[PDB]
Structure 1
């Protein structure tokens, strides 16, 4: 199966797989059962921003999520990603719905990785502030589409703009990303994305994640709903 490191914006509390009893941000290392969570005061129908940062010296994966006019939520976990992920990865966004539903709309996405050797810099940077119908530098999986209102819709939305249940979709950047190299003295990455989660319901589900995977990662069988398009089971 795939190797997954993700930051989840988990909109629906599944208390039998260890979610707390509230919407939360979480760090997921090879399991949907977050190694660390924080309470997230999710706002239905508001555009929010998530930031993810890591470096190989500190070996600490950190995330912050906010909305305009509101306090942030943050979570951190000590993990050496060179012990979890392979040397070459792909980076992506995932989202799902289940019997409860929401839009999983991405308005922008940026990513920077840097490898500094002892010679000196290798870097990759992309920024999307709008998505075209045919966005050739993204690999879309499952129900993900680009170009509606210039956005990335990770899960299915109707003609009328209503979100659909039982949906899963992902978008990965086309180029592999180099996160370890034998002469690297510092490796770092940052990601940002802006999202709009809207639901007609009092109980939206299931969430959006930023993830890093093996380069050939695909949507696991039956990873709708609580598994966020990332994991085949709740182990």
Structure 2
């Protein structure tokens, strides 16, 4: 299977697969069952910002998801990523809807990786082109006429659809560790807009890092956020 490290913004509590009973953010290391989570007071219809960081000395993957003036939710997990992930990876955003639904709209995304002693990679998109040639769009993901990356299916009127999954990967593999590296670090930020007509919107957005040839796993819809073939 793929190897996945992700920060999930999990709008829908699947308590039967170990979610806490409230929307949350989480760090997922090779499992949808987050190694650490924090309650997330999700604000439907407001633009959120997630900042994710790691470096290989501190070995603490952290994320903060905020909405202006209202909340900032943080979660951290200690982990040596460079023992979990392959040396080369692709980085991406995923999102799903399931029985319930929400827009999983990405308005901007930036990422920086540095490998020091050697390499760096930085990209940032404050809008997305109609044909984002440097994105690998998987499943339902497309960019819309406003320049937004719609991870999951939305109709022409902007309404979200259920049973959707989409991911966008940055086109270049990222060399996130090498044997002779002194320290490897990455930072990612994206802003997102989750709107939903559903009382319990679902399912959420992740920023994820995986093997380069990552693809949406069969069976990864809904609660598995397009990342995992099962809930193990």
Both proteins in one fold, TM over 0.5: yes
1:122 corresponds to which of 119, 124, 127: 119
Alignment match, 2:172: 175
3-state DSSP class of the match of 2:53?
strand
- How many residue pairs align between the two structures? 232
Contact 1:134–1:147, Cα closer than 8 Å, also in 2: no
Alignment match, 1:73: 73
3-state DSSP class of the match of 2:182?
strand
Deviation at 1:223, TM superposition (A): 1.1
How far apart, in 2, do the equivalents of 1:226 and 1:93 lie? 15
Contact 1:115–1:122, Cα closer than 8 Å, also in 2: yes
Alignment match, 1:152: 149
Asked if 1:28 is matched to 2:28, the reply is yes
Alignment match, 1:5: 5
Q: Deviations over 1:197-228 (max 9, x none)?
A: 00011110000000000000000012111000
- TM-score normalised by L of structure 1: 0.97
Alignment match, 1:137: 134
Moved over 6 A (4+): none
How far apart, in 1, do the equivalents of 2:145 and 2:19 lie? 32
How far apart, in 2, do the equivalents of 1:159 and 1:113 lie? 36
Q: Deviations over 1:100-138 (max 9, x none)?
A: 000000000000011111xxx421100100111111000
How far apart, in 1, do the equivalents of 2:52 and 2:156 lie? 33
Alignment match, 1:44: 44
Alignment match, 1:185: 182
State the superposition RMSD in angstroms.
0.7
Alignment match, 2:85: 85
